[PDB]
């Protein structure tokens, strides 16, 4: 088991500052890029920042929404990643997650922060039953999804529990069941569950890579009936 554990959230005033931390175990932390992603009811999943390796001079990239306000950093000797958040805005409210590996296999439990253009489209909802084959799709407003978008698929279960399923279009994360597979079909990315099970009732998000940032889809609610 890999473990990621975030901390540092809270209830803050607009204009304030806060620093989040995340400690990793169970994988060679210093060989992987790390990301922060936030979840809000208003905006769904939103990628915030990435930090690359020592060999990349710890290169960083940021969502346009946080550029100049947030700073990502890491300390490989402590297997930790940090997010310094300055000039907080109401729109920064959400649950913050550290995540990485191939490319979003592993997620922490999240830390809540309450402060008081490309579109990726997914089916809002799909209904299936056990033993059926169901395919979820992920479309880009830019045109065709290709292997150069490195499509990822992540599952959210209660309570805001995320697990990465597929990265690099069609690579299953370790320990992910065989019934999950990724593909490209008609210029969309697609997740297929071949033989759906009751426990697969969840929200599924896709994420697409565009040169130096990720854009998450709005999520699909999959109901498994019967």
């Amino acid at each position: 088991q890999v473990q990621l554990q975030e901390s540092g959230g809270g209830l803050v005033q607009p204009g304030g500052s806060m620093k989040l931390s995340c400690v990793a175990s169970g994988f060679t932390f210093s060989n992987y890029w790390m990301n922060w992603v936030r979840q809000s009811p208003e905006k769904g999943l939103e990628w915030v920042a990435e930090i690359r390796l020592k060999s990349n001079n710890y290169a960083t990239h940021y969502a346009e929404s946080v550029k100049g306000r947030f700073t990502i950093s890491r300390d490989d000797s402590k297997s930790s990643v940090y997010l310094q958040m300055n000039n907080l805005r109401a729109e920064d409210t959400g649950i913050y997650y550290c995540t990485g590996v191939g490319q979003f296999a592993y997620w922490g439990q999240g830390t809540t922060v309450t402060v008081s253009d490309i579109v990726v489209t997914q089916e809002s909802a799909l209904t299936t039953s056990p033993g059926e084959t169901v395919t979820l799709t992920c479309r880009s407003s830019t045109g065709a999804v290709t292997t150069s978008n490195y499509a990822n698929w992540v599952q959210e279960k209660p309570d805001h529990l995320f697990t990465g399923l597929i990265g690099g279009t069609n690579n299953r994360a370790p320990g992910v069941p065989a019934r999950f597979s990724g593909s490209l079909i008609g210029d969309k990315a697609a997740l297929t569950i071949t033989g759906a099970q009751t426990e697969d009732e969840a929200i599924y998000f896709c994420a697409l890579w565009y040169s130096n940032h990720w854009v998450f889809g709005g999520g699909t609610k999959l109901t498994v009936l019967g």
Binding site: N31, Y32, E50, V101, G102, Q103, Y150, W209, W214
Partner: peptide, 6 residues
């Protein structure tokens, strides 16, 4: 292009 280390 992103982190493609397995």
């Amino acid at each position: 292009a992103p982190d493609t280390r397995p």
